[model samples]
Target: MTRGNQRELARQKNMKKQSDSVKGKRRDDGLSAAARKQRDSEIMQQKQKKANEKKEEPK
Candidate 1:
C-alpha cells in the first residue's frame, strides 16, 4: 500500500484502540469519565506526534 494509505489505516486503528481503552476503563474499573478522558487525551496526543513524525521529512 501507499504511504498515505498506510498512515490512514494506522490512524484509524489507533483511534479505535483509544476508544476501546476508555470503554474498558469504564466497564472494568468504573473509572470516572474525567479520569478516562484525561488518559485518552494523553494517548491521543502521543498518537498525533507519532503520526506527524511519519509524515515529516527524513532529515
Candidate 2:
C-alpha cells in the first residue's frame, strides 16, 4: 500500500535534526562563556590568516 516505512524515515530525520541543532553549542561541555569565546576567536583568526596568505600568493 505504501512506498516504504514512512514512520521509520520520520524517526531518522528527527534524530538527524536534533543532532544538527546541538552540533555547534558547547553548553554541555562545561566551558565558561569567556573560554568558549576565546577559543572561537582563535579559530576564526587562524582561518583568516590562512585566507590572507593565499590571497598574497604570487600565482
Candidate 3:
C-alpha cells in the first residue's frame, strides 16, 4: 500500500531536476539553433585539437 500524492509530488520534482540541467538551460536561454550547431561543432573540433596537441607534447 502507499500514502498520499507522494508519487505525483516526485514526478513534478523529477521534472524540475531535469529542467535544472542542460535541457532546462537551453530552454531557458535564447541561443539560436544555428548557434548551437555551430558552437557544438567548434567545441568538438577544438577539444580534438587539444587532445592532439597534448599527445604530441608528451614526446
Candidate 4:
C-alpha cells in the first residue's frame, strides 16, 4: 500500500472511533438528555477554567 492509502485508513479509523463513542454513550451509559447535557456543559466549563488558569500562569 502507498503512503496516501495508509494515511486515509488512519483518518477513517479515527473517525470511526469518535463516532462509536457518541453512539455508545446513550445506549451503553444510559444517560438521559438532561443528564448528558449537564455533564457536557460541566465538562466544558471545567476545561475552560483549566485553560484560563494555564493562560494566567507565568511562563
Candidate 5:
C-alpha cells in the first residue's frame, strides 16, 4: 500500500512535469496556447477524477 501511494504521488508529480516540460514551447503564432491547453486539460481531468472518487467513497 505504501509503495502504491509512492507511485501515485510520483505519477501526479510527473503530470505537472509533463505540463511544465512544454512551458516554453510555442505555436505558429509564437504562443504557448497549445501547451497551456494541454496542461489545463490534464489538471482538470485529475481534479474531476478526484471529485468522482470522493463521491463514490462511503460516508
Candidate 6:
C-alpha cells in the first residue's frame, strides 16, 4: 500500500550499472554498521561543539 516498495523494485534496474569495477559497491571496507557511525558521531559532534564554543566567546 505504498510507493516505498514501488521505487525499491524499480531501483534494481539502475543498480546493475557498472563504472569500471569501482562500480556501485558500498561497505567494501572492513567497517560494518556498528563501527561506521563512530566516525559520524566523532565528526558531527566536533562541528556542533565548535559552533557552540564560538557562541560563548567574548569577541
The candidate that achieves the highest TM-score relative to the unseen native structure = 2
lDDT of 5: 0.63
Off by over 4 Å in 6: 1-28, 49-59
lDDT of the structure predicted as candidate 2: 0.67
**Residues 1-59 of candidate 3: C-alpha lDDT, one tens digit per residue:** 47755444443343323445465443536788899899989998888754444335354
Each prediction's TM-score versus the true structure: 0.35, 0.36, 0.34, 0.35, 0.29, 0.35
Clashes of each: 0, 0, 0, 0, 0, 0
Per-residue lDDT tens digits for candidate 2, residues 7-54, read 644433434334565666644658888998999899988787544443
True-structure lDDT of candidate 3: 0.64
Of 4 and 6, the candidate ahead on lDDT is 6
- Model 5, residue 30: C-alpha shift (Å): 8.7
> Against the true structure, candidate 4 has what lDDT?
0.64
lDDT of model 5 at residue 4?
Answer: 68
Error of 4 at 48 (Å): 1.0
Angstrom error at residue 37, model 6: 1.1
17-54: candidate 1 lDDT, tens digit per residue: 34454544434457788988999889988787544444
Q: What digit string (tens of lDDT, one per residue) describes model 4 on residues 1-59?
A: 46654444443343323445555443545788899899889998888754444356466
- Judged by lDDT, which candidate is best? 2
Model 6: per-residue lDDT, tens digit, 1-59?
A: 66555444443343544558675667566887777798878888887764344356376
Per-residue alpha-carbon lDDT of model 5 for 17-56, expressed as tens digits?
Answer: 3456567574455448788799888998877854344346
Worst 10 residues of 4 by lDDT: 10-19
